Design an enzyme around this catalytic site. Structure first.
Site: not given
Ligand SMILES: O=C(O)[C@@](O)(COP(=O)(O)O)[C@H](O)[C@H](O)COP(=O)(O)O
Ligand SMILES: O=C(O)[C@@](O)(COP(=O)(O)O)[C@H](O)[C@H](O)COP(=O)(O)O
Ligand SMILES: [Mg+2]
Ligand SMILES: [Mg+2]
Ligand SMILES: [Mg+2]
Ligand SMILES: [Mg+2]
Lengths: 481, 139, 481, 139, 245, 139
Positions: C124, C174, C176, C178, C202, C204-205, C294-295, C327, C334, C379
């Site tokens: 939160n 990866t 290609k 994609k 691999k 592609d994601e 893959h992130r 990754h 790039k 990558s």
């Molecule tokens: O943990 C908290 O603070 C709460 O339980 C609120 O408590 P209170 O009712 O005691 O404030 C809720 O999870 C938040 O409102 C989430 O935010 P949102 O709804 O913006 O995602």
């Molecule tokens: O989709 C892409 O672009 C790639 O397959 C790279 O292709 P190329 O090898 O042709 O560039 C990878 O997923 C990225 O590198 C991910 O980025 P990161 O590693 O920063 O998460």
């Molecule tokens: Mg990729």
């Molecule tokens: Mg809460």
């Protein structure tokens, strides 16, 4: 020498690096199809980068392109699969920021898979060096893709039918303190709050299973408190039992337990991730369970205007995935909430279709393809002295949650719940009668009037009257009405 | 105890003037009104008895008030609620339901507890009025 | 009345609002315990908000507090469960930005649950109105919490033993374009790339299962291409088969299929979320499978310095969860990658313990409790002309992936793979001999030398010699050496 | 074909001078060297035969070169690799392995395909040299 | 720790007296399925020791007569009775007959008193499959508690301790066999170490001595055992045999 | 019958002097005390009704005795219990609970038996007082 003889020598497919805008990913004349997925990005190019080239780079690296030409494109219907940046506008009252519209062919995306949609749209482009900042502002999900998704397991309409509650917002409260309570004391708080008038309570988002309280202890005690309050009031009652857990196996175990003991509702945390969320949304439909989504972690990417994902997009993804509730803001509570943005979020969740409404942040017309409506939840730092504001900004189909605003009552948890419910019903009754209740000279008076015959409400107004959370917003509109 | 089904049951019993304004509010939105009666107050008693058909074509709140007061004269002691139905696409459901009549004394409910497997309890909410007398003679 | 007589009247637990710094969440004298979870936040308070009060607000709303006092605290060992902000420093070269250290009791967190850890730490507080920007920069995960997590299913050491490959970085690519390729052509690309010298290719994601290629078609054809290249070379070969899918049931189905057909490795996308990731990390250990992460989506919250989650924290969470690859950046490709930040990420993934190293963004000393080491993957937009830079910045235990940099070769996929492998082995051989290979007058010469007897490498150097990605970084250090 | 196990097999066969520098590199890291032989080139043939014990206490690269050239004189035609072992916590594993000797002609492998369930193929990589002759007589 | 060293010729006697189990190893274990606090909350009993009784004669009674004794003892005031450690399933009484009759006696006493009642149904059996079958049956008929014997051994004990937490069951451990290695001062394992291992494994009760009854129990050692089982941390207390903080 | 919940119910009904001594004992341990009422004696009725808030910040046993006697004046016929709560780490729970008031006549319970599978009986403990009358009118 055969590789030399058969080298590709065309402008587009000879080896080497060419700009993305020359690779097919820019077409200002492109005609959008009803089946396309559309994305609107707020792009801040690095200094010296052409804004159209940045838009084409985003379009290319989120569809089929990489950084250098590859002949294997020619083994595919390559023209069909390339996304098309088709419109790049300057952002109002900015100097180097652009709105970029990009269209994606329907066939790029695995049916019913949020993980696949996001793998393309947000997978890599936010880390691209050439763009200094990137924000996904809106998406037009086409009717033909939506019909592959379940939508809400239950939805607003069937939820109110299951609860037999129609005519006012629903009421809830998070149990407090956030952590430390035992299962037996958790059920006590839930009993007191429901008996005092609340429709629901809920586990805090970080209440899962811990040394001070293991989850089965909480579930069994809460069901005793829920059924006690239902027999004491003649109403359907419940509490969002949090089934968030480390693995899908454990989530399912907690969900099945909640069902076996008769809970009307379970809750999950967004940090569990899209694949677990989609799995449990299907489960909730299959097992007659209301599914409450707490948006834990959302603000790590949704808070700042220059970069990340606008929450209205998250709203679309989660309504597609099929949660029945999602937290969506209060305007006047302790968490960020510009009112124009909030009203836009609520429309995305509740309407059968969206019209362009730039002051609300709605950049695309979009039919919701009869996917059920998702119940917004307003929670966090609100109290019954704000009831006229909550009713005005947030409407009828919402859960208003008062954690500290219930349990912080000096005369006990029941009194705190009663104060909140009396304030709610008095406000709705006056609204329906025609009062100008949002006016600061009218709304507060409606509450003071009801407080003359409700000790708990008088006490609550006395305690929290001067409490506000007035800070400048970060997530703000770009257009006025 | 006070049955707190309905959306205004934490407020005092509504006067006829207050009911009329709520009806006027519902009809201004184009909602259809109806009237329903029961003497089973159980929270899961979905289907209270219909007082005629819903008033789909009715345009004057006074005609709703007329049928409500006819229901009040004819029905046995118990509960009456007034509902507003929105047939619009996206809703097709009730959007307002409040209690307009309740008995002079409601004994309420108790919680029946059956020993389940393990520590599980099998609950049943039981109405004192219903277990004691048949429909039409409960209040 | 009884409720008025029993109202709490102490300074701390009478009803009403008091500052978080007066509620127990600030203690400059706090003594950190070896079992505490520690968090470092970069906090930007709203104008007029006291910086210590903001740190106490973050500490409170991520542990046990809400916005008003609640008597139910007194049903718990409340002092034990409150988190403690214990140090607030100004950020160098900034106004109104602070580093805030916060300590959390070990018992707040469900054992082995990343979802629970994050529900508290990031749930939160990033949406809190009083804070205009908030970034999680680092965390000290205590030894006693780490031992509840699996860590990498396989880890760097066992991975190299499964592959029988020691002495150089691993190589990948990866496929290609994609999207758009058929399963049969996917297996062709994989066959050509592996036969030409790559250890891996691999998916592609965003290659999951789609109209142009359903996933089983890709898996079977790739396993023909993999086994063909292994029999043609006498090496262990593989390709990261992407099992990312909408539901956990479908992910498991794809994982089991990949195992049944003998794949050494599968890959998953971060957009699937923490619960699915933890589930499949346990599965990968139980089923003798390498697990590549893959992130996807990481940069929506990890890109900007003022707000979100620094990727080094993600590295800790994912090494705890148990992926075998993640990754982690290239510096010279790039995607965004400041070299000091990148070097810090790689240490977080690969070392048995971390020492404070502020220029690298390592703010806590932290033992890794013998959780296995996670393989960084470099990558995106890299090519063999940069090999001296990759070896220098990224070290020995890394997968260098060349997608466009393999398939973009004018003389075909095998040639592109061969150019990358010759460049890698020539660079490592010269590094080991003592060459000053990172110097721009030395590294490029080692490659030109090898290219005199390797046509494919000469061609690749000719094609991509002048390609760089020189942009100003957004995620940058705060301290110099 | 060329067996491309080892970390330098895309470069020409290493001279003794080149091998010595790689050994020198490994030993300056404190790594232990050993020498291993096989005439089964299968990619899953984990355990090549040990040439004595790993040289844990050895400090002069010339002593590793001495044992390598003694292995070359004594072993049958086939492959020899040199490995470097890092026994420190966090590794406890090989960190370098490259081929120092290979046969004059390696026929390589073929892919045996057994019909599985459905469309699945059950694969076996088979070595021409191994299937033809026993250990010690393969090359 | 105990695998081979107790048989080494070079040591004439060896006894494991205490262990410091580190925080970071403990967190990998469940600890008690229920624990003292939640147990009293399940029973709604706070303020005094709990009360129990082993059914006698040890062996020979029918299931119907076992249920009679349980009914009488509970109705007379006991919180629990229990199967004897060697009551499992035998020609004179097969286990399901005992379980069904005891649940009738238990529920009768509960309705006669307004209190939660129970009896430790012994699920000790030859194989893990049979232990699970008896545990599942005890759960299905609503027993608040089952018991196991230490002779079943550590792997079955850890399995059923996880099962007890997952199935809302109190888990009573009888320490059958403990005194074969824990009795003599010169050799074996001191029971305070068994206490640590069994609390780690996750049993809810363990027999720990009386001082004044028919079984061995020096008060300083016993008091030490009780501290090991009940405290949130241990301080060095050499008279009570506590050698490690 | 006598309801033998509570920890002193096999002793005679406690005098006020006896209750004060138990209160003094609890308070000397630093425990918080509270007072609760019910007229559902079911063994699984975990949540008796709270009489105000627990007396966390009270040092004088006479104050607990004052609230107990105010509860006795205001509550309907039924049961009152006094509890002591230990918020210390490792407990965070009630550590003493005993009955201070009980009705003149408690009819008690019967055992309801439902035929399950096989020989299994599905049991329900039913209170005579609760099934006959609603809360506030049971004794
Ligand atoms: O943990 C908290 O603070 C709460 O339980 C609120 O408590 P209170 O009712 O005691 O404030 C809720 O999870 C938040 O409102 C989430 O935010 P949102 O709804 O913006 O995602
Ligand atoms: O989709 C892409 O672009 C790639 O397959 C790279 O292709 P190329 O090898 O042709 O560039 C990878 O997923 C990225 O590198 C991910 O980025 P990161 O590693 O920063 O998460
Ligand atoms: Mg990729
Ligand atoms: Mg809460
Ligand atoms: Mg064969
Ligand atoms: Mg015995």
């Amino acid at each position: 020498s055969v590789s030399e003889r058969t080298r590709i020598k065309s402008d587009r497919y000879e080896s080497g690096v060419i700009p993305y805008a020359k690779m097919g990913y820019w077409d200002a004349a492109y005609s959008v199809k009803d089946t396309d997925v559309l994305a609107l990005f707020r792009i801040t190019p690095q200094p010296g980068v052409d804004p159209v080239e940045a838009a084409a780079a985003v379009a290319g690296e989120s569809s089929t392109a990489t950084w250098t030409v590859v002949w294997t494109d020619l083994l595919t219907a390559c023209e069909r699969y390339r996304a098309k940046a088709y419109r790049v506008d300057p952002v109002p009252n900015s100097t180097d920021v652009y709105f970029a519209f990009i269209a994606y062919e329907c066939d790029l995306f695995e049916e019913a898979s949020l993980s696949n949609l996001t793998a393309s749209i947000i997978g890599n482009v936010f880390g691209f060096k050439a763009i200094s900042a990137l924000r996904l502002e809106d998406m037009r999900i086409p009717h033909s893709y939506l019909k592959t998704f379940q939508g809400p397991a239950t939805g607003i309409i069937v939820e109110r039918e299951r609860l037999n509650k129609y005519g006012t917002p629903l009421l809830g409260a998070t149990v407090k303190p956030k952590l430390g309570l035992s299962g037996k004391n958790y059920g006590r708080v839930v009993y007191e709050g429901l008996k005092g008038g609340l429709d629901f309570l809920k586990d805090d988002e970080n209440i899962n299973s811990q040394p001070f309280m293991r989850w089965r202890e909480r579930f069994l005690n809460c069901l005793e408190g829920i059924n006690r309050a239902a027999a004491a009031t003649g109403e359907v009652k419940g509490s969002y039992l949090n089934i968030t857990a480390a693995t899908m196996e454990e989530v399912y175990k907690r969900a099945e337990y909640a069902k076996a003991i008769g809970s009307v509702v379970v809750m999950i945390d967004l940090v569990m991730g899209y694949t677990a969320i989609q799995s449990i949304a299907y489960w909730a439909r299959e097992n007659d369970m209301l599914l409450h989504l707490h948006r834990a972690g959302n603000s790590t990417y949704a808070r700042q205007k220059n970069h990340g994902i606008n929450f209205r997009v998250i709203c679309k993804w989660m309504r597609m995935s099929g949660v029945d509730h999602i937290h969506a803001g209060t305007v006047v509570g302790k968490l960020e909430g510009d009112p124009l943005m909030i009203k836009g979020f609520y429309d995305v969740l509740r309407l059968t279709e969206l019209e362009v409404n730039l002051p609300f942040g709605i950049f695309f017309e979009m039919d919701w393809a009869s996917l059920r409506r998702c119940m917004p939840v307003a929670s966090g730092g609100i109290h019954c002295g704000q009831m006229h504001q909550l009713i005005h900004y947030l409407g009828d189909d919402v859960v208003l949650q008062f954690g500290g605003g219930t349990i912080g009552h000096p005369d006990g948890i029941q009194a705190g719940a009663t104060a909140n419910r009396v304030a709610l019903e008095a406000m709705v009754l006056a609204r329906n009668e025609g009062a100008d209740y949002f006016n600061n000279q009218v709304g507060p008076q409606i509450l003071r009037d009801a407080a003359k015959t409700c000790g708990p409400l008088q006490t609550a107004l006395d305690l929290w009257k001067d409490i506000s959370f007035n800070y400048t917003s970060t997530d703000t509109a770009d257009f006025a009405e | 105890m006070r049955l707190t089904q309905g959306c205004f049951s934490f407020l005092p019993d509504l006067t006829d003037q207050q009911i009329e304004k709520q009806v006027t509010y519902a009809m201004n939105r184009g909602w259809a009104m109806n009237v329903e009666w029961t003497d089973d107050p159980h929270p899961r008693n979905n289907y209270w008895e219909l007082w005629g058909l819903p008033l789909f074509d009715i345009k004057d709140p006074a005609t709703v008030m007329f049928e409500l007061n006819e229901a009040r004269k004819s029905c046995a002691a118990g509960y009456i609620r007034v509902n507003a139905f929105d047939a619009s696409y996206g809703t097709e459901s009730c959007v307002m339901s409040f209690i307009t009549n309740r008995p002079a004394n409601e004994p309420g409910f108790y919680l029946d507890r059956t020993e389940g497997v393990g520590r599980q309890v099998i609950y049943s909410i039981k109405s004192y009025s219903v277990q004691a007398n048949p429909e039409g003679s409960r209040y």
